[PDB]
Design a protein around this motif. Sequence first.
Motif, PDB file in Angstrom:
ATOM      1  N   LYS B  29      21.574  73.156  -8.635  1.00  8.97           N
ATOM      2  CA  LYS B  29      20.437  73.071  -7.722  1.00  8.97           C
ATOM      3  C   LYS B  29      20.853  72.492  -6.377  1.00  8.97           C
ATOM      4  O   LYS B  29      20.471  73.020  -5.326  1.00  8.97           O
ATOM      5  CB  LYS B  29      19.332  72.214  -8.334  1.00  8.97           C
ATOM      6  CG  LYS B  29      18.308  71.738  -7.321  1.00  8.97           C
ATOM      7  CD  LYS B  29      17.449  70.624  -7.885  1.00  8.97           C
ATOM      8  CE  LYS B  29      16.430  70.147  -6.863  1.00  8.97           C
ATOM      9  NZ  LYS B  29      15.593  69.025  -7.378  1.00  8.97           N
ATOM     10  N   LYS B  30      21.629  71.411  -6.392  1.00  7.75           N
ATOM     11  CA  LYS B  30      22.067  70.793  -5.144  1.00  7.75           C
ATOM     12  C   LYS B  30      22.962  71.738  -4.350  1.00  7.75           C
ATOM     13  O   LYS B  30      22.824  71.865  -3.125  1.00  7.75           O
ATOM     14  CB  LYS B  30      22.784  69.476  -5.444  1.00  7.75           C
ATOM     15  CG  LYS B  30      23.133  68.658  -4.220  1.00  7.75           C
ATOM     16  CD  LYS B  30      24.554  68.925  -3.755  1.00  7.75           C
ATOM     17  CE  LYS B  30      24.950  67.995  -2.622  1.00  7.75           C
ATOM     18  NZ  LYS B  30      26.332  68.271  -2.143  1.00  7.75           N
ATOM     19  N   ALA B  31      23.887  72.419  -5.035  1.00  2.22           N
ATOM     20  CA  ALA B  31      24.766  73.357  -4.342  1.00  2.22           C
ATOM     21  C   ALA B  31      23.982  74.517  -3.742  1.00  2.22           C
ATOM     22  O   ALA B  31      24.212  74.907  -2.587  1.00  2.22           O
ATOM     23  CB  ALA B  31      25.842  73.872  -5.297  1.00  2.22           C
ATOM     24  N   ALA B  32      23.044  75.084  -4.506  1.00  3.80           N
ATOM     25  CA  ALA B  32      22.222  76.169  -3.991  1.00  3.80           C
ATOM     26  C   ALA B  32      21.372  75.705  -2.816  1.00  3.80           C
ATOM     27  O   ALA B  32      21.178  76.450  -1.855  1.00  3.80           O
ATOM     28  CB  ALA B  32      21.341  76.731  -5.103  1.00  3.80           C
ATOM     29  N   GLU B  33      20.855  74.476  -2.883  1.00  4.44           N
ATOM     30  CA  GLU B  33      20.055  73.935  -1.787  1.00  4.44           C
ATOM     31  C   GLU B  33      20.876  73.820  -0.506  1.00  4.44           C
ATOM     32  O   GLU B  33      20.415  74.196   0.578  1.00  4.44           O
ATOM     33  CB  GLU B  33      19.489  72.576  -2.200  1.00  4.44           C
ATOM     34  CG  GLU B  33      19.479  71.526  -1.102  1.00  4.44           C
ATOM     35  CD  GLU B  33      18.421  71.785  -0.053  1.00  4.44           C
ATOM     36  OE1 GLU B  33      17.574  72.673  -0.267  1.00  4.44           O
ATOM     37  OE2 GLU B  33      18.440  71.096   0.990  1.00  4.44           O
ATOM     38  N   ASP B  34      22.098  73.298  -0.613  1.00  7.71           N
ATOM     39  CA  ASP B  34      22.936  73.184   0.579  1.00  7.71           C
ATOM     40  C   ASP B  34      23.305  74.553   1.135  1.00  7.71           C
ATOM     41  O   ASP B  34      23.296  74.762   2.358  1.00  7.71           O
ATOM     42  CB  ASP B  34      24.187  72.369   0.262  1.00  7.71           C
ATOM     43  CG  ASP B  34      23.860  70.948  -0.143  1.00  7.71           C
ATOM     44  OD1 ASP B  34      22.668  70.661  -0.377  1.00  7.71           O
ATOM     45  OD2 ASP B  34      24.791  70.120  -0.220  1.00  7.71           O
ATOM     46  N   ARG B  35      23.622  75.509   0.256  1.00  8.77           N
ATOM     47  CA  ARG B  35      23.920  76.857   0.729  1.00  8.77           C
ATOM     48  C   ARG B  35      22.705  77.476   1.411  1.00  8.77           C
ATOM     49  O   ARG B  35      22.834  78.194   2.411  1.00  8.77           O
ATOM     50  CB  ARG B  35      24.395  77.731  -0.434  1.00  8.77           C
ATOM     51  CG  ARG B  35      24.818  79.124  -0.015  1.00  8.77           C
ATOM     52  CD  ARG B  35      25.043  80.015  -1.214  1.00  8.77           C
ATOM     53  NE  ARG B  35      24.687  81.395  -0.913  1.00  8.77           N
ATOM     54  CZ  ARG B  35      23.450  81.868  -0.967  1.00  8.77           C
ATOM     55  NH1 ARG B  35      22.436  81.104  -1.338  1.00  8.77           N
ATOM     56  NH2 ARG B  35      23.227  83.136  -0.641  1.00  8.77           N
ATOM     57  N   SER B  36      21.513  77.206   0.879  1.00 11.91           N
ATOM     58  CA  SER B  36      20.287  77.692   1.501  1.00 11.91           C
ATOM     59  C   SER B  36      20.113  77.097   2.888  1.00 11.91           C
ATOM     60  O   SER B  36      19.691  77.783   3.825  1.00 11.91           O
ATOM     61  CB  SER B  36      19.097  77.350   0.611  1.00 11.91           C
ATOM     62  OG  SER B  36      19.469  77.359  -0.752  1.00 11.91           O
ATOM     63  N   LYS B  37      20.421  75.805   3.034  1.00 15.35           N
ATOM     64  CA  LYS B  37      20.369  75.171   4.346  1.00 15.35           C
ATOM     65  C   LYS B  37      21.319  75.852   5.319  1.00 15.35           C
ATOM     66  O   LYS B  37      20.975  76.098   6.482  1.00 15.35           O
ATOM     67  CB  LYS B  37      20.702  73.686   4.217  1.00 15.35           C
ATOM     68  CG  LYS B  37      21.019  73.013   5.530  1.00 15.35           C
ATOM     69  CD  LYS B  37      21.406  71.562   5.306  1.00 15.35           C
ATOM     70  CE  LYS B  37      21.733  70.869   6.614  1.00 15.35           C
ATOM     71  NZ  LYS B  37      22.064  69.431   6.402  1.00 15.35           N
ATOM     72  N   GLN B  38      22.529  76.169   4.853  1.00 13.73           N
ATOM     73  CA  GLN B  38      23.477  76.910   5.687  1.00 13.73           C
ATOM     74  C   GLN B  38      22.902  78.261   6.102  1.00 13.73           C
ATOM     75  O   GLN B  38      23.057  78.687   7.255  1.00 13.73           O
ATOM     76  CB  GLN B  38      24.793  77.109   4.943  1.00 13.73           C
ATOM     77  CG  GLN B  38      25.565  75.841   4.684  1.00 13.73           C
ATOM     78  CD  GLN B  38      26.762  76.079   3.797  1.00 13.73           C
ATOM     79  OE1 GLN B  38      26.833  77.086   3.089  1.00 13.73           O
ATOM     80  NE2 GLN B  38      27.716  75.159   3.826  1.00 13.73           N
ATOM     81  N   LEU B  39      22.250  78.949   5.165  1.00 14.81           N
ATOM     82  CA  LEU B  39      21.651  80.244   5.476  1.00 14.81           C
ATOM     83  C   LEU B  39      20.580  80.107   6.553  1.00 14.81           C
ATOM     84  O   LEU B  39      20.514  80.918   7.481  1.00 14.81           O
ATOM     85  CB  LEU B  39      21.076  80.873   4.211  1.00 14.81           C
ATOM     86  CG  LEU B  39      22.111  81.345   3.188  1.00 14.81           C
ATOM     87  CD1 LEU B  39      21.431  81.989   1.993  1.00 14.81           C
ATOM     88  CD2 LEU B  39      23.092  82.307   3.829  1.00 14.81           C
ATOM     89  N   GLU B  40      19.731  79.081   6.442  1.00 15.62           N
ATOM     90  CA  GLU B  40      18.712  78.844   7.464  1.00 15.62           C
ATOM     91  C   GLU B  40      19.354  78.621   8.830  1.00 15.62           C
ATOM     92  O   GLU B  40      18.927  79.201   9.842  1.00 15.62           O
ATOM     93  CB  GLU B  40      17.860  77.627   7.102  1.00 15.62           C
ATOM     94  CG  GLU B  40      17.321  77.592   5.698  1.00 15.62           C
ATOM     95  CD  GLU B  40      17.155  76.170   5.192  1.00 15.62           C
ATOM     96  OE1 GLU B  40      17.533  75.234   5.925  1.00 15.62           O
ATOM     97  OE2 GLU B  40      16.653  75.987   4.067  1.00 15.62           O
ATOM     98  N   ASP B  41      20.366  77.751   8.875  1.00 12.38           N
ATOM     99  CA  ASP B  41      20.985  77.401  10.143  1.00 12.38           C
ATOM    100  C   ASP B  41      21.623  78.620  10.801  1.00 12.38           C
ATOM    101  O   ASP B  41      21.493  78.822  12.013  1.00 12.38           O
ATOM    102  CB  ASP B  41      22.020  76.299   9.928  1.00 12.38           C
ATOM    103  CG  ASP B  41      21.444  75.103   9.204  1.00 12.38           C
ATOM    104  OD1 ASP B  41      20.224  75.105   8.934  1.00 12.38           O
ATOM    105  OD2 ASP B  41      22.206  74.161   8.905  1.00 12.38           O
ATOM    106  N   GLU B  42      22.316  79.448  10.017  1.00 12.73           N
ATOM    107  CA  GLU B  42      22.893  80.669  10.567  1.00 12.73           C
ATOM    108  C   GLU B  42      21.829  81.679  10.971  1.00 12.73           C
ATOM    109  O   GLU B  42      22.008  82.380  11.973  1.00 12.73           O
ATOM    110  CB  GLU B  42      23.849  81.304   9.561  1.00 12.73           C
ATOM    111  CG  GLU B  42      25.062  80.450   9.229  1.00 12.73           C
ATOM    112  CD  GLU B  42      26.040  81.161   8.315  1.00 12.73           C
ATOM    113  OE1 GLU B  42      25.802  82.341   7.993  1.00 12.73           O
ATOM    114  OE2 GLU B  42      27.050  80.534   7.922  1.00 12.73           O
ATOM    115  N   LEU B  43      20.727  81.757  10.225  1.00 16.92           N
ATOM    116  CA  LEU B  43      19.681  82.726  10.530  1.00 16.92           C
ATOM    117  C   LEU B  43      19.002  82.404  11.855  1.00 16.92           C
ATOM    118  O   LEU B  43      18.625  83.323  12.598  1.00 16.92           O
ATOM    119  CB  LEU B  43      18.668  82.755   9.389  1.00 16.92           C
ATOM    120  CG  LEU B  43      17.539  83.781   9.444  1.00 16.92           C
ATOM    121  CD1 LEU B  43      17.247  84.295   8.050  1.00 16.92           C
ATOM    122  CD2 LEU B  43      16.285  83.182  10.052  1.00 16.92           C
ATOM    123  N   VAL B  44      18.827  81.120  12.163  1.00 19.92           N
ATOM    124  CA  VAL B  44      18.213  80.757  13.440  1.00 19.92           C
ATOM    125  C   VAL B  44      19.058  81.262  14.605  1.00 19.92           C
ATOM    126  O   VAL B  44      18.542  81.852  15.565  1.00 19.92           O
ATOM    127  CB  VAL B  44      17.997  79.236  13.522  1.00 19.92           C
ATOM    128  CG1 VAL B  44      17.455  78.855  14.884  1.00 19.92           C
ATOM    129  CG2 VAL B  44      17.045  78.782  12.434  1.00 19.92           C
TER     130      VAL B  44
END
Lengths: 56, 55
Positions: B29-44
């Motif tokens: 869960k923690k790893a997926a959450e951090d990867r999701s944060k990376q996805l958000e940051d790149e998407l912006v």
Amino acid sequence: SDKLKEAETRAEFAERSVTKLEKSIDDLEDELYAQKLKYKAISEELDHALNDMTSI
Amino acid sequence: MDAIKKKMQMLKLDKENALDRAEQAEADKKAAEDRSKQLEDELVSLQKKLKGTED
């Protein structure tokens, strides 16, 4: 007459003794009944713990 | 005796199994959450470069 008195006295003592023995055996039989109840209860409790643990 | 040992060991095994499974799940869960944060940051930034391209 003297012999009759002696025999009657010994027979009366024998009757008293058998009465005492019958009372004593009654007491010990009751005690054994109580201990049998104790074993029944403890085995029942062990079985209850067993069924509770096997059935969660 | 016999029943106490097996039941106690099985229940402790159940507790340990649940604990380790929970720990693995929380790690993923923690790893997926951090990867999701990376996805958000790149998407912006992808949106920003898209907006410039459209202008």
